[PDB]
Amino acid sequence: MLKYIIPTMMLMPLTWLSKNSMIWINTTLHSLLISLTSLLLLNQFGDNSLNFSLTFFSDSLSTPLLILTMWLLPLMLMASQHHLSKENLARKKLFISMLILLQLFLIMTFTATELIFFYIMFEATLVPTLIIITRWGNQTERLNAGLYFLFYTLAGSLPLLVALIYIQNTMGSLNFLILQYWVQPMPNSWSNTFMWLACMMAFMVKMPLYGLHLWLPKAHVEAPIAGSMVLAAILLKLGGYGMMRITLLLNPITDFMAYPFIMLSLWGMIMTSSICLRQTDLKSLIAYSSVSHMALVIVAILIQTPWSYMGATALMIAHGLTSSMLFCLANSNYERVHSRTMILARGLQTLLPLMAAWWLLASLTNLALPPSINLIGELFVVMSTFSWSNITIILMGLNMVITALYSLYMLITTQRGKHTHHINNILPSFTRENALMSLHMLPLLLLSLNPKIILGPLY
Amino acid sequence: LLDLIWLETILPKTISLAQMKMSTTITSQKGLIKLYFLSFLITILISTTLLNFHE
Amino acid sequence: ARQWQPDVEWAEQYGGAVMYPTKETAHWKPPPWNDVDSNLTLNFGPQ
Amino acid sequence: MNPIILIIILMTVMLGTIIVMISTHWLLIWIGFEMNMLAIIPIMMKKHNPRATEASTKYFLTQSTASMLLMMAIIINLMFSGQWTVMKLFNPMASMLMTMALAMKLGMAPFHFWVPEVTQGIPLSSGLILLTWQKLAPMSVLYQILPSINLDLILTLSILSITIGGWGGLNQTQLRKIMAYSSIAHMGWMTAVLLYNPTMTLLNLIIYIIMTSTMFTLFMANSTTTTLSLSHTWNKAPIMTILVLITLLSMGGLPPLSGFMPKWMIIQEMTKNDSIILPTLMAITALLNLYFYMRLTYSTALTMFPSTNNMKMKWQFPTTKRMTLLPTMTVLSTMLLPLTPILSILE
Amino acid sequence: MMTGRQARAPLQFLPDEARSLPPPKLTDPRLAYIGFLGYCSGLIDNAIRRRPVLSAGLHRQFLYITSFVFVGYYLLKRQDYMYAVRDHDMFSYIKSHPEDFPEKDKKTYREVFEEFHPVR
Amino acid sequence: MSLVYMNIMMAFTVSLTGLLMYRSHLMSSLLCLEGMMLSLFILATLMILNSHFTLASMMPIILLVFAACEAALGLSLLVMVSNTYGTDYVQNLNLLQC
Amino acid sequence: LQYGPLAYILGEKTTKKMTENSKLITVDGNICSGKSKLAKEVAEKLGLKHFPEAGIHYADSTTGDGKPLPVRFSGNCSLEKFYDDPKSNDGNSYRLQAWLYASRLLQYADALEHLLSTGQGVVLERSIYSDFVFLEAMYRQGFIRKQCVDHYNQVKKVTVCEYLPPHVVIYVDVPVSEVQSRIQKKGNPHEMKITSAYLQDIENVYKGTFLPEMSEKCEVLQYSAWEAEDAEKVVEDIQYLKYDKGPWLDQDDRKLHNLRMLVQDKLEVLNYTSIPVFLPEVTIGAHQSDRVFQEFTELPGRKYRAGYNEDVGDKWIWLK
Amino acid sequence: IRWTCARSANVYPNFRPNTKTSLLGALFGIGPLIFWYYVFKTDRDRKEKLIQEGKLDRTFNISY
Amino acid sequence: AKTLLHQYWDIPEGTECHRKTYAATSIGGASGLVVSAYSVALKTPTSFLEGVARTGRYTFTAAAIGAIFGLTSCISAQVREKPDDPLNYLIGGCAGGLTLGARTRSYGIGAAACAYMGLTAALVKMGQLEGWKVFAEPKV
Amino acid sequence: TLRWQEDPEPEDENLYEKNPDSHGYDKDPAVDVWNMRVVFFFGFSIVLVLGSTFVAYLPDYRMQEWARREAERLVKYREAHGLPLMESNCFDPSKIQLPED
Amino acid sequence: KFYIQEPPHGSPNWLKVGLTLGTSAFLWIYLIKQHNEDVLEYKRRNGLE
Numbered sequence A: 001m002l003k004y005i006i007p008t009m010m011l012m013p014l015t016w017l018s019k020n021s022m023i024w025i026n027t028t029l030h031s032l033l034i035s036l037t038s039l040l041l042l043n044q045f046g047d048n049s050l051n052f053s054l055t056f057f058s059d060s061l062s063t064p065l066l067i068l069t070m071w072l073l074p075l076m077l078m079a080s081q082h083h084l085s086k087e088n089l090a091r092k093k094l095f096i097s098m099l100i101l102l103q104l105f106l107i108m109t110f111t112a113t114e115l116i117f118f119y120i121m122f123e124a125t126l127v128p129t130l131i132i133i134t135r136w137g138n139q140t141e142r143l144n145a146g147l148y149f150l151f152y153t154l155a156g157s158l159p160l161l162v163a164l165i166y167i168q169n170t171m172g173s174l175n176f177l178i179l180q181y182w183v184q185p186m187p188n189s190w191s192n193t194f195m196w197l198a199c200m201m202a203f204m205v206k207m208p209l210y211g212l213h214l215w216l217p218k219a220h221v222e223a224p225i226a227g228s229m230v231l232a233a234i235l236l237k238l239g240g241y242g243m244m245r246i247t248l249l250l251n252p253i254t255d256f257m258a259y260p261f262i263m264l265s266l267w268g269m270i271m272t273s274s275i276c277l278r279q280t281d282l283k284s285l286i287a288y289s290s291v292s293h294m295a296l297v298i299v300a301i302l303i304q305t306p307w308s309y310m311g312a313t314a315l316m317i318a319h320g321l322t323s324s325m326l327f328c329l330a331n332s333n334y335e336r337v338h339s340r341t342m343i344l345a346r347g348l349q350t351l352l353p354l355m356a357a358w359w360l361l362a363s364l365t366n367l368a369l370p371p372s373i374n375l376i377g378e379l380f381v382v383m384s385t386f387s388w389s390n391i392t393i394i395l396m397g398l399n400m401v402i403t404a405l406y407s408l409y410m411l412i413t414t415q416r417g418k419h420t421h422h423i424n425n426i427l428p429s430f431t432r433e434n435a436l437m438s439l440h441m442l443p444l445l446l447l448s449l450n451p452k453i454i455l456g457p458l459y
Numbered sequence B: 001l002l003d004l005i006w007l008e009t010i011l012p013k014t015i016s017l018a019q020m021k022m023s024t025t026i027t028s029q030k031g032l033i034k035l036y037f038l039s040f041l042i043t044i045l046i047s048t049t050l051l052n053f054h055e
Numbered sequence C: 001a002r003q004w005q006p007d008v009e010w011a012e013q014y015g016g017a018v019m020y021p022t023k024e025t026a027h028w029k030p031p032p033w034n035d036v037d038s039n040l041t042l043n044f045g046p047q
Numbered sequence D: 001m002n003p004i005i006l007i008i009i010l011m012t013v014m015l016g017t018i019i020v021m022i023s024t025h026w027l028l029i030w031i032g033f034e035m036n037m038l039a040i041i042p043i044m045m046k047k048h049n050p051r052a053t054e055a056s057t058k059y060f061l062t063q064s065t066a067s068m069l070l071m072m073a074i075i076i077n078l079m080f081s082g083q084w085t086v087m088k089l090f091n092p093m094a095s096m097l098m099t100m101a102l103a104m105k106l107g108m109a110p111f112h113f114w115v116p117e118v119t120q121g122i123p124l125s126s127g128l129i130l131l132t133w134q135k136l137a138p139m140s141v142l143y144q145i146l147p148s149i150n151l152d153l154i155l156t157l158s159i160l161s162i163t164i165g166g167w168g169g170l171n172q173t174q175l176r177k178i179m180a181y182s183s184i185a186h187m188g189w190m191t192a193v194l195l196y197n198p199t200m201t202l203l204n205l206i207i208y209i210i211m212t213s214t215m216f217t218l219f220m221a222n223s224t225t226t227t228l229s230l231s232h233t234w235n236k237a238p239i240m241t242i243l244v245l246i247t248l249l250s251m252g253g254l255p256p257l258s259g260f261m262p263k264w265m266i267i268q269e270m271t272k273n274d275s276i277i278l279p280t281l282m283a284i285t286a287l288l289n290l291y292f293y294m295r296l297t298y299s300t301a302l303t304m305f306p307s308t309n310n311m312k313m314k315w316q317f318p319t320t321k322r323m324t325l326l327p328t329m330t331v332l333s334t335m336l337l338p339l340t341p342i343l344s345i346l347e
Numbered sequence E: 001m002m003t004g005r006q007a008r009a010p011l012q013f014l015p016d017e018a019r020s021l022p023p024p025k026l027t028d029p030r031l032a033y034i035g036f037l038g039y040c041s042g043l044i045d046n047a048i049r050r051r052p053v054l055s056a057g058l059h060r061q062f063l064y065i066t067s068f069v070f071v072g073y074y075l076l077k078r079q080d081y082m083y084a085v086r087d088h089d090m091f092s093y094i095k096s097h098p099e100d101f102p103e104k105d106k107k108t109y110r111e112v113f114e115e116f117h118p119v120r
Numbered sequence F: 001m002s003l004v005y006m007n008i009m010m011a012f013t014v015s016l017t018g019l020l021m022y023r024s025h026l027m028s029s030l031l032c033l034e035g036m037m038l039s040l041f042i043l044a045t046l047m048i049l050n051s052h053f054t055l056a057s058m059m060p061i062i063l064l065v066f067a068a069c070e071a072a073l074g075l076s077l078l079v080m081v082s083n084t085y086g087t088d089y090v091q092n093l094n095l096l097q098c
Numbered sequence G: 001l002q003y004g005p006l007a008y009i010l011g012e013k014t015t016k017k018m019t020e021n022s023k024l025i026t027v028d029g030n031i032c033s034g035k036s037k038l039a040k041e042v043a044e045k046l047g048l049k050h051f052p053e054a055g056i057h058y059a060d061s062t063t064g065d066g067k068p069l070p071v072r073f074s075g076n077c078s079l080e081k082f083y084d085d086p087k088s089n090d091g092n093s094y095r096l097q098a099w100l101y102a103s104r105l106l107q108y109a110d111a112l113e114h115l116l117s118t119g120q121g122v123v124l125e126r127s128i129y130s131d132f133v134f135l136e137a138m139y140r141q142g143f144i145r146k147q148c149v150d151h152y153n154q155v156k157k158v159t160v161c162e163y164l165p166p167h168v169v170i171y172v173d174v175p176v177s178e179v180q181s182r183i184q185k186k187g188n189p190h191e192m193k194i195t196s197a198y199l200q201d202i203e204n205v206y207k208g209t210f211l212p213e214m215s216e217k218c219e220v221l222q223y224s225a226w227e228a229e230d231a232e233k234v235v236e237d238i239q240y241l242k243y244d245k246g247p248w249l250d251q252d253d254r255k256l257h258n259l260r261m262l263v264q265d266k267l268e269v270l271n272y273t274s275i276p277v278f279l280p281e282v283t284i285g286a287h288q289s290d291r292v293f294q295e296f297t298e299l300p301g302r303k304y305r306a307g308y309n310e311d312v313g314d315k316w317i318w319l320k
Numbered sequence H: 001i002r003w004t005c006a007r008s009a010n011v012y013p014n015f016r017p018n019t020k021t022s023l024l025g026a027l028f029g030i031g032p033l034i035f036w037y038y039v040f041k042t043d044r045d046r047k048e049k050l051i052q053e054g055k056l057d058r059t060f061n062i063s064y
Numbered sequence I: 001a002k003t004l005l006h007q008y009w010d011i012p013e014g015t016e017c018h019r020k021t022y023a024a025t026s027i028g029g030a031s032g033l034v035v036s037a038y039s040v041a042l043k044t045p046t047s048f049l050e051g052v053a054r055t056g057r058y059t060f061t062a063a064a065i066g067a068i069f070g071l072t073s074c075i076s077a078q079v080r081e082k083p084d085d086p087l088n089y090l091i092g093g094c095a096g097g098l099t100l101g102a103r104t105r106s107y108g109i110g111a112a113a114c115a116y117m118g119l120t121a122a123l124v125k126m127g128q129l130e131g132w133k134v135f136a137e138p139k140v
Numbered sequence J: 001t002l003r004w005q006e007d008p009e010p011e012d013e014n015l016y017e018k019n020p021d022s023h024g025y026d027k028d029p030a031v032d033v034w035n036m037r038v039v040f041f042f043g044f045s046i047v048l049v050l051g052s053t054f055v056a057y058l059p060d061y062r063m064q065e066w067a068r069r070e071a072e073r074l075v076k077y078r079e080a081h082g083l084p085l086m087e088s089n090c091f092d093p094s095k096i097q098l099p100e101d
Numbered sequence K: 001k002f003y004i005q006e007p008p009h010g011s012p013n014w015l016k017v018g019l020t021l022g023t024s025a026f027l028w029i030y031l032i033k034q035h036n037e038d039v040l041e042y043k044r045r046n047g048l049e
């Protein structure tokens, strides 16, 4: 994986040695070159993963996440290049350096063969997001957003690391190419129960699980939108990678223990859909929708069937793209009106038609319109959860009503109706904004034609 | 009722107020050295007699 | 509109003697900034 | 203070520490400890202030009590053993008295009632000399007598030290009391692993010394002893805010910084002995330490506090102070993780 | 815990057995990382004293790089010497005591019993 | 062991409880400290004289010597308080609390 | 740099260099006492030299090109707008006074460094021990409030305890009517607004509380306005004084070495000027502070240290 | 802005846990969770005891 | 104090009531004396009578905590007839939490104490069952 | 008496007045044109269409088409010799040591 | 002549930079000589030439 890490660490001086007016152009161009270069990871076989070296490997699972990450960096760079025009040049380079370091830690996270390495850089990712959230926000509560985001996640994983070290004393190696053959069944005891809890709770917090989701809306209604997109789209996927790398070792005790987690996830996804039905802020509504989607992903990986794994990976990637572009929509609205209220700016279809079209496409892809990959993943998870038990479909069915009901309503009061009379600073569409929106939207439609590249490690 | 109060109460706020009270009670010392050496004496007496650490 | 910045109320919230003013630490003044805080009458008598 | 007399005093305290390091006799150990005491005493009284006199009186009384307990432990060991070699002790009560003496000398809880006032009443360089150089000789003595150390006593003192240090650091605005309680927490983290692998104790001591010296050098460079002045440092220089942010992130225990290097491997030498709940509890109290560290970082660097109009004058003069090896110690305190196996040089 | 090995002959950075080991090459990645650490330290000196960061004091940067590389090379030599000592004592004790560490007959999968738990 | 050993060590811990419980005067605590050292010296000298250890006979007196080398320091740590406060009461020594 | 503990170990004693000439002199009085040349008179025939009085832009003159800086970079205050409306809401008067006080601290530090380095007496004007009287006038017109005076007393208390009073202090006694007529014939239109109570309170606090503390720690000679133009009588009073008053005799080589170590580091001197006592008159907004700091960064000769600027004509920076 | 601040940010600071609030939170927080847990539990034991004895028709169920 | 805990664990659980209750009461009394001695050490009582009143208050509170905890564990294990079940200890922990809330005159403190030392009692019970060690002896 | 003297809060800067041809990148028109050309060339013309051509003609992902062909052989074997299509035993039932019951 | 005074760091001290260059060259030469001594002593100590 040295053919992508070295470009990132070599682009680091490029954003440090660039001129006073060509930082954005050079960084965007070279990040797009890295994004094209990243397509070589798809040399996948039906039996063996592409094991690059001793400490780097990438199966069919992590490759779409890597492609999403280093396609996501230029979108973040375009989405965060407006409000930082008055910011000092050294701090502009600091922000771009923070984004570059976050990408580097993310790509090193998904390809770490050893689980200790994966943990170490999986919360080396914690420093840049905390710095960006606390420094480049726009409200007072960002200070509180630096606490609840941090002291949740670490409190889930400082047990977990100990458990990982215990496996290093039990199996003798935490390598994932070894542990697929050296894995032993887990007996039923209180010690194995607490080992399962310690190995589960960190990524349960990082999804987030319902009850532990309080850090997600408080860290999204105030972030700079580069931070909002990286948090919603790719930073929540570390929990999914933790599931699909850890659940091999936790069999068969997971089957008769994950009942309250599934109950909490299902009823909390119902609750968060209902909370989306009665929200006043765009950012909080999108964050609670993300909570519902990650609760669905939690159920999908907890029932551990192959169809569920396909649906979980597809839903993860599709939800990441959709939530990132929804946050782009909300950022455009907050840029134009300087507020986050939903009822303030209404009837923008009368003034902005192309943003209305992007709103319509975002809302259609949010409620899993076929044949998009969101519908593919959601349908596969629906069938897998029906295979787990029958009555679950009832607990799905209401949600599939509610996940439509707000998804259009959040559109309608922002786009349809009589426009607000005392608002007159609604500028037309900047080409940068619509270029970013199309760069978000076109891959999401394109992946529907060829879904087999994002269908998990067992397609 | 649930998202804004009770889930916000059970995990983070109870812990924060518990650490608030504990840290208030720990560092309200008056700075007297007679009390400090009395504390050293009762510490030595607890370690020697009650705990029986010379077994 | 712009980024919020701390005002004098936040800075004077951080300006106490202790972080959390309890019932005892009310007369605790902050320390100084520069870290700086009967001759015997004898009678040579007549005798 | 006279420079020649100050140099003689520094040579005396380093000579006392070296005497404790190199001697194979208990009397020479106590002589080196007495020289250490008598040479560090005037370091605190360089400014001739009543606060310095109060701190010196408290330090002298506590270390004198520790020295007398150490002498009684030595005499008990002599009477039950008949020799003077610095090795395992031949009595549990002598082990008790020496452990209490070394805990009093180190400042480990519940004998932590002298470190914050002593650190607060003295200047920054004297605090550096105290909190760095006084944590070498008792660690050497505990390294020598670890066969005879009672397990329950040292583990209870360690967990009490970490909990008390975190709870103390949660409620202090002064920088020096924050340093003292952080030193207690690091002391507990360092002495919890003493009986399992003393190389981990030495490694954590080295990293703690490097980080604490880095922070005290930054405080000396900014000439700040309060949280508000530390916040006001943003207008004088942004680079100072960057280094205080990265260093105080390093002492929190975050990867990929160097402060995650010792503590994590402490667990690596405590899960091998099947001690599971103790590193979890100490990690939770490390999260408490990280919480007050995070509050301090919010004060100094991540939010720029309002300043005054006088500091413009300070913009016309560069910092002419002598920062002793500041970039090297900052780099060693921040990015020592990829050189983790270098601890094998301490065997 | 290697103190017994450092018991007879003390305060030796590199003993006579350390010369029989292959020294680290100058193209070792760890040495390059330590050189990068020295370069970053020189950059920090150019930053904190209000100097230009990339041109001022090339002699200081070269001195920092050389000193960091020197101490890193010697520390890496001590590290690999200690690890070789660890493995050699390992193999010596595992030759020395075969009664307390017997052999294992690795069975095939055609006869070892395993319990299959269905996922449904 | 014996009897005089018991008496001397009990004198040591009696003087320790005297030092560890103050009575509002620094120099009285210094006297108790020198009493603890007196018990230490007496115990060490008696232990040597019982065990015929000739060459260790330097250690008691030197121990004694070093004690004076700190005890005067305690006296040197008294008048400085008397150079700031009128008296030397320890309950007046509570300035270091903020 | 140039001096340190190694130099004192090497043998650099400051008491070797101070002969009978090394007398620290400051001349202070009313607004237009006529001392403006008189102190300079003591410069031009006693083998001494006299820096001008510490103005708003003295630090801008002693560092950099020597060209005084604009108001936004240094001071952010105006003496003329203070003279027009001294009861302004933004507290421009206190800002001007505080900048003048910091300028006086820097001036006294430079003079003491020159005295302890070359052994030459330096003539000054309105030293740091004689500025607070102006603020007392500022308190007796209703111009500033109680909290700002408390802040000034805190600042002076924490910055003056490390220094020494001068050798002699020269006062020129001018009546209020004479100096008022002099002000009216100055001709500058921005100083036509001085009230009589200003000078009356200046003289009242000058004679009431300043004399019974300055007369013990130093030597003060109360002159008169018509004899202030007589230079020969003043210089004959200077040469035939007994140097026995003040702490100038019980100061050995180590005390003056500590004084020189404190003085020659200017940020050590100016460290306690900006104490974190929060006042509405002095506190500057964070956005404004960042903008002003970035504006001062792009000024020529201020982006880097004093000898590391390629935009001013410095060579061999890569070897420095 | 007053209404949007009163909707979310001004709920906890003027909250006092009494019998009514705690009773409502316990009724609406752990009730449906317990109900769904028990329903899904007994469904799982019924399905498992049907499938181990061969009574559940799984003739064509090969995708899971 | 090494014999109080062992004598607490020397009797089978849920078999006899008053001896286990008095053992837990004695452990609580020792803890109360320790914490009251520390409280009168660092914090000066205004008088001798107020100091011994504080000592008696802490002793009574901790003795009631231990007695009710041991009692509730005893009748819980007797009624459910399950000696190897930590749910009895969780019920006893909530009983102790209600006791702490009653003696301190609070309710939210009572519920938080229910949760906290119920979890602590459960952790003690599976520590006894699974043989966990708080202070593990050195092996490697 | 005004507290913490601060510049007035700046208004929302508008971009279509000083430059009606601006694409929302910066103020210099050449910088805007170059940034627009760079993103529209290296984001759409370079990654989308060439990435689509790459993943359309990707060489037999996970040998899936190969999974047909060998299977197309295998039944062609066992439908010509009377063998069953697939067997209930994944491995050889004669090469397993059954544990005792 | 920009600055009003002569800054101490406004002139290149040739002795200091010469000593720094000489120390760096000495350290490098000692490093390569030590590496050569180690590598041929390694080939001598095992005979792997």
Ligand SMILES: CCCCCCCCCCCCCCCCCC(=O)OC[C@H](COP(=O)([O-])OCC[N+](C)(C)C)OC(=O)CCCCCCCCCCCCCCCCC
Pocket: A152, A155, A156, A159, A160, A162, A163, A166, A191, A192, A194, A195, A197, A198, A201, A205, B015, D274, D275, D276, D277, D280, D284, D287, I123, I130, I131, I132
């Ligand atoms: C987000 C906040 C909540 C986070 C919750 C996280 C999950 C909860 C449980 C975590 C326990 C700690 C890690 C244990 C890893 C054990 C691995 C293992 O193999 O164990 C077997 C070992 C078994 O012991 P053994 O392996 O040494 O014994 C040898 C084997 N036998 C048993 C056969 C003899 O388990 C243990 O030793 C004890 C495990 C339980 C630990 C209980 C104490 C901690 C309680 C939870 C605290 C959580 C943080 C709270 C504060 C948060 C911040 C405010």
Ligand SMILES: CCCCCCCCCCCCCCCCCC(=O)OC[C@H](COP(=O)([O-])OCC[N+](C)(C)C)OC(=O)CCCCCCCCCCCCCCCCC
Pocket: A063, A064, A065, A067, A068, A071, A317, A443, A446, A447, A449, A450, A453, A454, J047, J048, J049, J051, J052, J053, J055, J056, J057, J058
């Ligand atoms: C991937 C994970 C991270 C996500 C973010 C990724 C960022 C980087 C993106 C890089 C560029 C995009 C890469 C993926 C491209 C996917 C598309 C692709 O190439 O597919 C290959 C597939 C390949 O087809 P195939 O798989 O069948 O071909 C087999 C392969 N060969 C040819 C070798 C045998 O292309 C197509 O399917 C194209 C079909 C023809 C074109 C469409 C015709 C119909 C158009 C619509 C007509 C109207 C219909 C009715 C409409 C009604 C109203 C709605």
Ligand SMILES: Nc1ncnc2c1ncn2[C@@H]1O[C@H](COP(=O)(O)O)[C@@H](O)[C@H]1O
Pocket: G030, G031, G032, G033, G036, G053, G097, G100, G131, G134, G135
């Ligand atoms: N602290 C101060 N407050 C008010 N005015 C001052 C202060 N310091 C100096 N001045 C003025 O500075 C001038 C001194 O210059 P000169 O007239 O040459 O003596 C007079 O106008 C004084 O009133």
